[PDB]
């Protein structure tokens, strides 16, 4: 996260860190708890990862340094990638992880509510992106979970910025005109969470951008409301 601040413990209880164990154990991507065996994340996180067996999902983590040899984690039973995601395209960037065991809910780990079918993103003026990603284009994964408040931009505005790419209605963009706050590398798959009527909703999944936090180059997010049906179907 570029231009972010440290989160506090329990602040983002739906945020998870997905680790690969191969060749060495480390943070791969963010994700969101959306039910007791279900993590929602970005499909593109699984480029050179196919086997669930290499994944470990950690919840209730503030600092990556909290994760020790003996720390509890969730195994992943299945990776569910949307059928229309292609490795040659940036869209349909959404996946489910089915966990091998059940997340136990506490104040520091619980699901985030999905937007309801037909909800409208223009409603949201309090949107936050979170993760352990880079603070600038070339950097390192950060130890403490970071947060930044960023404003949603209209699809029409976002297409104007990305003449080369097809920004569909299944994508949402966010960022300041002047840049400075954005998701960056390592933030992929994590939430864009917007607070409305005192409730946090999962509006976006961090997906892609042209660099990090550049002037007139908003980050792009999978627009979660357009996938509620997919989610419900795959999870039943």
């Amino acid at each position, epitope marked *: 996260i570029v231009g972010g601040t440290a989160s506090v413990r329990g602040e983002w209880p739906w945020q998870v860190t997905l680790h690969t164990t191969s*060749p060495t154990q*480390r943070h*791969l*991507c963010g994700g969101s708890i959306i039910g007791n065996q279900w993590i929602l994340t970005a499909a*593109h*996180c699984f*480029y*050179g990862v196919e086997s669930p067996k290499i994944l470990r999902v950690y919840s209730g983590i503030l600092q990556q340094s909290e994760i020790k040899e003996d720390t509890s984690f969730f195994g992943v039973q299945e990776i569910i990638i949307h059928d229309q995601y*292609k*490795m*040659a*395209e*940036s869209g349909y*960037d959404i996946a489910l992880l089915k966990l091998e065991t059940t997340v136990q809910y506490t104040d520091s780990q619980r699901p985030i509510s999905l937007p309801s079918k037909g909800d409208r993103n223009v409603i949201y003026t309090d949107c936050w992106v979170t993760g352990w990603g*880079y603070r600038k*284009l*070339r950097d*390192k*994964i950060q130890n403490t979970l970071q947060k930044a408040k960023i404003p949603l931009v209209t699809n029409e505005e976002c297409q104007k910025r990305y003449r*080369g*790419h097809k920004i569909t209605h299944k994508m949402i963009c966010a960022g300041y005109r002047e840049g400075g706050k954005d998701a*960056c*590398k*390592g933030d*992929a798959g994590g939430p864009l969470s917007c607070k409305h009527n005192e409730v946090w909703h999962l509006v976006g999944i961090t*997906s*892609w*951008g*042209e*660099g*990090c936090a550049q002037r007139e180059r908003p980050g792009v997010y999978t627009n979660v409301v357009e996938y509620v049906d997919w989610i419900l179907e795959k999870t039943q």
Partner: antibody
Amino acid sequence: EVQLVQSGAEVKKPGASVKVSCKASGYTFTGYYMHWVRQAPGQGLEWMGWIDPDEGDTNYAQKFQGRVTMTRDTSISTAYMELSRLRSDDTAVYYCARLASGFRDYWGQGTLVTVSS
Amino acid sequence: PSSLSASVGDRVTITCRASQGIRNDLGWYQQKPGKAPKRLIYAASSLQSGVPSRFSGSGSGTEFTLTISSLQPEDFATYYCLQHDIYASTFGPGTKVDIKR
């Protein structure tokens, strides 16, 4: 004008170490990371790692982890790459380079390191 | 390592693969024998200052492409992508564009 000037050619025995220097001028040294890239004779480019001359943090390719150390000395605008436990396929030209996105790139002239008995 | 024989005037397209996680952080470099590489494109599609406009780049998903619209004599060289991912940067293998006389 930006210039990166490296130290001269080295010959080393297998199992020894080598330390190559790269001195920068014409820009703010601490503003831009410095990357090390090597190329064995007739072969492709191989990225080795970077160093942040501001805070001093490094990042090394997997292949060199545990055998390379990059360092800097800010006041003489110089980066260093030290490779240990040399083997015959460490024989290569080594470059330092400023590769920051959104600006021109700059490269050192290269340093031949030959590893042999 | 790859070899491509082309004529002056041909259009050439070179393809690199990298995680979409790189956030377009992909450079294209040109190298002639005896010389250090020179960057042509950064950020997948931005043409570096001083580079001719016949060079262009594109990124979509995991697929990154350098296009030379119409090759000129001075363009015969070896081309490499450099992807900058979360834990490491990596050069692609090298495409040598030879003169098809």
